[PDB]
Amino acid sequence: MGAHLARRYLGDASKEPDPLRMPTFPPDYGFPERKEREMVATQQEMNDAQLMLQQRDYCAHYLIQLLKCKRDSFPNFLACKHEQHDWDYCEHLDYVKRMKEFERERRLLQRKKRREQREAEMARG
């Protein structure tokens, strides 16, 4: 649900991004110096914690901390609110990073369309 579906289907699919092919531009295209994402939890730590493969994303350390907090205070199942909020906030930040990637792809596509239209106009004239 959203306006992006309307723009892509009842509009210019060339200008709108394709979720199954994104990204289609190099990561450094437009970023002079871009920093690689940092992973806090190690493979051994995640493997020992037995996180499900879907849960082994870049927010895994907060999930591990939440699990450890829940296990220790077992009878009191309401004593992990801070850890839960930390994990949720990290997931929120990851989601907004994904949204930024989608928006960057979209405006790069429309900039490419403008550039190619300008080149075609110049070649014609």
Binding site: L5, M39, D57
Partner: protein, 104 residues
Amino acid sequence: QQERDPWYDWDHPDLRLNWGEPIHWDLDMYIRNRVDTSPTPVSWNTMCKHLFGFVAFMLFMFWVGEIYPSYQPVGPKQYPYNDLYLERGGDPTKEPEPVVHYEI
């Protein structure tokens, strides 16, 4: 036998038959536990048309929704170690093609 009268004092109430009357050749399939031919509030042709139309329309719309899916304005999810190369059963000896995710 479903079409037969339920208020009559049949000799066999469950089968709705009388003793001595001729038995239909297909009584074994026209019993009340089996094929029913009693009249319906709507015509058979109308019922068939409506049912077929509903199922065909639903199949067509499922295909249309498949070719025009619904999603959110987000990019692909990112996983740390070469999209979890080893965790998904990859070969430790062979070196995977690196996958790098950058901040934004």
